[PDB]
């Protein structure tokens, strides 16, 4: 879109010397300005994860690919978090059988919805948390 412009700006914040590549040391600089203090090994891992051609640095195409996947994955997370908030009527961080039942009609019996909860209820507390919800929605 015109989001490439925004991605170029973000890239330019990493590419401190404007050579069109992001090095481990430039990434290091960025992360310390955000209040993190990564090791050289941690930095290398992060570069390696994005470095499609294995040349040891991140060019703008590599960065753009990474940003587009991160944005899709961020958009998805947010969609699932919104769905979860809709179910979690009382905002307690768990979906009850009662909340699932309400939502699910808008006609299931307590027994039928208990069954749905149990299927999703990895930790056995008889409710569905966000982590369990993500599992159920993405599997």
């Amino acid at each position: 879109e015109e989001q490439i412009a925004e991605f170029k700006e973000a890239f330019s914040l990493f590419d401190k010397d404007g050579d069109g590549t992001i090095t481990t040391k430039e990434l290091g600089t960025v992360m310390r300005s955000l209040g993190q203090n990564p090791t050289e090994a941690e930095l290398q891992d992060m570069i390696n994860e994005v470095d499609a051609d294995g040349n040891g640095t991140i060019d703008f195409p590599e960065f753009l690919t990474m940003m587009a996947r991160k944005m899709k994955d961020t958009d998805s997370e947010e969609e699932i978090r919104e769905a979860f908030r809709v179910f979690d009527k009382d905002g307690n961080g768990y979906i009850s059988a009662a909340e699932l039942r309400h939502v699910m009609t808008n006609k299931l019996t307590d027994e039928e919805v208990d069954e749905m909860i149990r299927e999703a209820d990895i930790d056995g507390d008889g409710q569905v948390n966000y982590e369990e919800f993500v599992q159920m929605m993405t599997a």
Partner: peptide, 15 residues
């Protein structure tokens, strides 16, 4: 039924 949830979410989202 998770399908039904995915579909109705897709239709009634961002209200």
């Amino acid at each position: 039924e998770v399908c039904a949830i995915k579909i109705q979410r897709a239709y009634r989202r961002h209200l």
